[PDB]
């Protein structure tokens, strides 16, 4: 019971670290839709595809 609490706490901590990186993946580029996006920062590190 102590073991399964450690895995549950560490899973929701790393995935909130990754979600904060996910939110900062797109925030410098949503304010300017006219700016081009690199192909490295679209699929490998971040998730978003080319749109519009």
């Amino acid at each position: 019971c102590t073991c399964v609490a450690i895995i549950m706490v560490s899973c929701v901590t790393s995935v909130w670290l990754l979600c904060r990186t996910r939110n900062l993946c797109i925030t410098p580029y949503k304010l300017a839709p006219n700016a081009q996006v690199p192909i490295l920062l679209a699929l490998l590190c971040c998730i978003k595809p080319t749109r519009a």
Partner: protein
């Protein structure tokens, strides 16, 4: 230009600007926009880059166009006067730089918005404005001089 202000207890303490597709609002001010269409928008909080939501429908999009790259340091338009600096903001005289003047856009000679003011009340005889802009490739940056109180 179309710039709806922000009302709180009868007085005006901020301004909300509209660019192509998206609606801007400073985080430092609290209140409701006078446009009832803009009140139903789900504006979300974010970091210093001031990300909000442009959830407006199709009938009034692209009010003005945001200024692209290749920025010269010459003349630029402003609501209370003129600014003439690219890396920084110009030392505008007094009158402008009081309280509740946040969110006012800075336009170009073709009517293209370049920057949005956020601070820099007064820094002596020379007043510097803390604005957001795009540095080289359209990536939104935030430039803040020293001693820039929220204005």
């Amino acid at each position: 230009d179309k710039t709806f202000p922000i009302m709180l207890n009868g007085q005006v303490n901020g301004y909300a600007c509209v660019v192509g597709g998206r609606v801007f609002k400073p985080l430092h001010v609290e209140g409701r926009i006078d446009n009832e269409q803009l009140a139903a928008i789900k504006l979300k909080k974010a970091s210093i880059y001031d990300l909000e939501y442009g959830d407006v429908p199709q009938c009034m999009k692209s009010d003005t166009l945001q200024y692209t790259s290749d920025k010269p340091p010459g003349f630029y338009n402003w609501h209370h006067g003129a600014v003439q600096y690219e890396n920084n903001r110009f030392t505008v005289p007094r009158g402008v730089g009081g309280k509740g003047d946040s969110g006012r856009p800075i336009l170009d000679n073709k009517g293209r918005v370049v920057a949005i003011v956020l601070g820099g009340v007064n820094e002596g005889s020379r007043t510097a404005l803390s604005v957001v802009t795009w540095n080289q490739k359209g990536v939104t940056v935030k430039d803040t001089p020293e001693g820039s109180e929220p204005w």
